[PDB]
C-alpha cells in the first residue's frame, strides 16, 4: 500500500486478481497451490472522508517432503525397528544392554544431525519433533524393560524363591494362552 498517500488522494487498483506467475522459476522445495490478490479499504473513526487502501497478495505453498522423509524418517525408522529387536536377543548373550544403549547413542547422534534440519520454532511441536520424541521415549522404555528382564533372569533362588502366582502365570498359562 501507499505509505503516506490515502485513498482520497492516491487510489491503487490490482492489475489482475492473481499474481503473474508466467515468469515464475520452478522452486525445488515448495509448490504454489493457489494465489490471489485482494484490495482492501479500511476506514478509521477519525475520518469518513479518507479511506486507506492496500492490496494484499497471498500464496498457498505446500512443502515437498521427500528431502525430510529421506534424510530423517528412514534412519529414525531403522532405529525404532532395532529398538524392539533387543527382546529377541537372549540374555545369555550378555549384549542386550550393549545393543540398546548403542542404539540410544546412535539416535542421540542423529538427533544432533536432526537439529540442523528441523526448525527451532517453539510455537507448537512439529510432527517430526513428535515422532522424534516418540522414538526417544520408545528407546528409553525398551532399555528400562530390558534392565527389568535381565534382573529377572539372573535372580537367584537362594534368596528369592519363585512365588506360586508367578509360576502359574508365566510357566503354565503364558505358553498355553
Amino acid at each position: 500500500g501507499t505509505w503516506t498517500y490515502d485513498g482520497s488522494v492516491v487510489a491503487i487498483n490490482p492489475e489482475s486478481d492473481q499474481p503473474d506467475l508466467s515468469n515464475f522459476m520452478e522452486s525445488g522445495e515448495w509448490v504454489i497451490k493457489e494465489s490471489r490478490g485482494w484490495k482492501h479499504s479500511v476506514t478509521y473513526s477519525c475520518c469518513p472522508d479518507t479511506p486507506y487502501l492496500d492490496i494484499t497478495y497471498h500464496f498457498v505453498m505446500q512443502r515437498l517432503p521427500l528431502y525430510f522423509i529421506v534424510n530423517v524418517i528412514i534412519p529414525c525408522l531403522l532405529f525404532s525397528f532395532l529398538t524392539g529387536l533387543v527382546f529377541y536377543l537372549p540374555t545369555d548373550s550378555g549384549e542386550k544392554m550393549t545393543l540398546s544403549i548403542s542404539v540410544l547413542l546412535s539416535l542421540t547422534v542423529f538427533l544432533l544431525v536432526i537439529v540442523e534440519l528441523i526448525p527451532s520454532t517453539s510455537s507448537a511441536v512439529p510432527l517430526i519433533g513428535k515422532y522424534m520424541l516418540f522414538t526417544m521415549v520408545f528407546v528409553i522404555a525398551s532399555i528400562i524393560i530390558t534392565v527389568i528382564v535381565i534382573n529377572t533372569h539372573h535372580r537367584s533362588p537362594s534368596t528369592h524363591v519363585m512365588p506360586n502366582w508367578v509360576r502359574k502365570v508365566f510357566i503354565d498359562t503364558i505358553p498355553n494362552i
Binding site: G28, E29, L64, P65, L66, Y67, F68, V70, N71, I74, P75, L78, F81, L82, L85, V86, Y88, L89, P90, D92, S93, G94, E95, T98, L99, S102, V103, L105, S106, V109, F110, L112, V113, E116, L117
Partner: protein, 172 residues
C-alpha cells in the same frame, strides 16, 4: 559478440593463461546463444557446463563407507561365543551415522530428487541394520537349549544335513 576473426564465435571467452582455475569444477562446454522473443525483448544466454571433480568425496565419504560395509560383512564370521557381535555391528552403524552427519553439511536441500550418494548411504545403513537383525537371529539360535526349546524335525533335517553340503560344511 563475434570472435577476433569476425567469425560467429558464440562462446564464453577464457584467457587460457590468465583464467583462475577452479579446484572443484572443470569447464567442458561454454557456448552462447541469442534467444529470440516468443514488450518483446531479446536475451543473450551464456552457458557454463561444468563437471564436478569428485576426489574429495571419494576419499572422505565413499571409501570409509566401503570399509564399514566390509566390517559389517565380517560380523557374520565372528563366532557367537565371542560376545562382541552386537558391539561390532552397532558401532559400525554409529560410524555410518557419523559419516551421515558429515555428508549432511554437503548435500543440497532441494527435494526434487535424491543424490546417488544419499541412496548409497541409505543402502549401506539398510545393510548394517539387516546385519544386526540376522546376528540377533543367530545369537537367538545359539543360546537355545532343551530347557527352553525342542528342535523340530524340519529344522534338524534342513540345517544339519542339507545346507552343510551346499555350504561345504561338515560336522566333525
Amino acid at each position: 559478440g563475434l570472435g577476433p576473426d569476425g567469425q560467429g564465435h558464440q562462446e564464453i571467452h577464457i584467457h587460457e593463461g590468465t583464467f583462475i582455475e577452479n579446484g572443484q569444477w572443470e569447464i567442458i562446454h561454454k557456448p552462447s546463444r541469442l534467444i529470440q522473443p516468443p514488450g518483446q525483448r531479446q536475451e543473450v544466454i551464456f552457458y557454463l557446463i561444468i563437471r564436478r571433480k569428485p576426489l574429495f568425496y571419494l576419499v572422505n565419504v565413499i571409501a570409509p563407507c566401503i570399509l564399514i560395509t566390509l566390517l559389517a560383512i565380517f560380523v557374520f564370521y565372528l563366532p557367537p561365543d565371542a560376545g562382541e557381535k552386537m558391539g561390532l555391528s552397532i558401532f559400525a552403524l554409529l560410524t555410518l551415522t557419523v559419516f551421515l552427519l558429515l555428508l549432511a553439511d554437503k548435500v543440497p536441500e532441494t527435494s526434487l530428487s535424491v543424490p546417488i550418494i544419499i541412496k548409497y548411504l541409505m543402502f549401506t545403513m539398510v545393510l548394517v541394520t539387516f546385519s544386526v537383525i540376522l546376528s540377533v537371529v543367530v545369537l537367538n539360535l545359539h543360546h537355545r537349549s532343551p530347557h527352553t526349546h525342542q528342535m523340530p524335525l524340519w529344522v534338524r533335517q534342513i540345517f544339519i544335513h542339507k545346507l552343510p553340503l551346499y555350504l561345504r560344511l561338515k560336522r566333525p
